[PDB]
């Protein structure tokens, strides 16, 4: 397993705990209701250890990038701007995201040829399954 193995554009197909997530980071109702209904494309891109992730959906698009292993201030969608870490370990593309003495981590894998990514802060959970597009 390689971080180039992520490479492509994704849809959302199902979603598990994402509302609940939401409500643990805080995220205020307007910010929730778009969440709940948008139907993402995540497209991900990796040139060596230059990674880019931009979201895209009719309500909402978010782009970040970064080097692997290297601290950064990633502005999140709802709004935070957290210090952030991304490496690929043990076949995961795995996201730290810190502030306020806050922490919540976010990994992305390939299994059976769907992104599955996962979500968590204080013991609540969200998964994400996405369909590899054309
Ligand atoms: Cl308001 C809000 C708050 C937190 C969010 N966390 C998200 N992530 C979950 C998957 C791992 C990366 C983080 C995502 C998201 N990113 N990629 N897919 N969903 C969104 C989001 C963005 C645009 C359209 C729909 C949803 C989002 C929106």
Redesign the pocket.
């Known amino acids: 397993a390689t971080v180039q193995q992520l490479e492509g554009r994704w849809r959302?197909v199902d979603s598990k705990g994402?509302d609940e997530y939401?409500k643990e980071?805080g995220?205020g109702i307007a910010?929730?209701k778009?969440?709940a209904m948008?139907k993402?494309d995540?497209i991900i891109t990796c040139d060596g250890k230059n990674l880019t992730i931009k979201?895209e959906?009719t309500?909402?698009?978010?782009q970040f990038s970064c080097t692997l292993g290297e601290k950064f201030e990633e502005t999140?969608?709802?709004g935070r701007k957290t210090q952030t870490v991304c490496n690929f370990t043990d076949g995961a593309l795995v996201?730290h995201q810190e502030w306020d003495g806050k922490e919540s981590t976010?990994t992305?894998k390939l299994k059976d040829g769907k992104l599955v990514?996962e979500?968590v802060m204080n013991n609540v959970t969200?998964t994400?399954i996405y369909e590899k597009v054309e």
């Open positions: 959302l994402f939401m980071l995220v910010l929730r778009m969440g948008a993402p995540c979201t959906s309500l909402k698009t978010t999140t969608a709802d996201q976010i992305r990514v979500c969200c994400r």
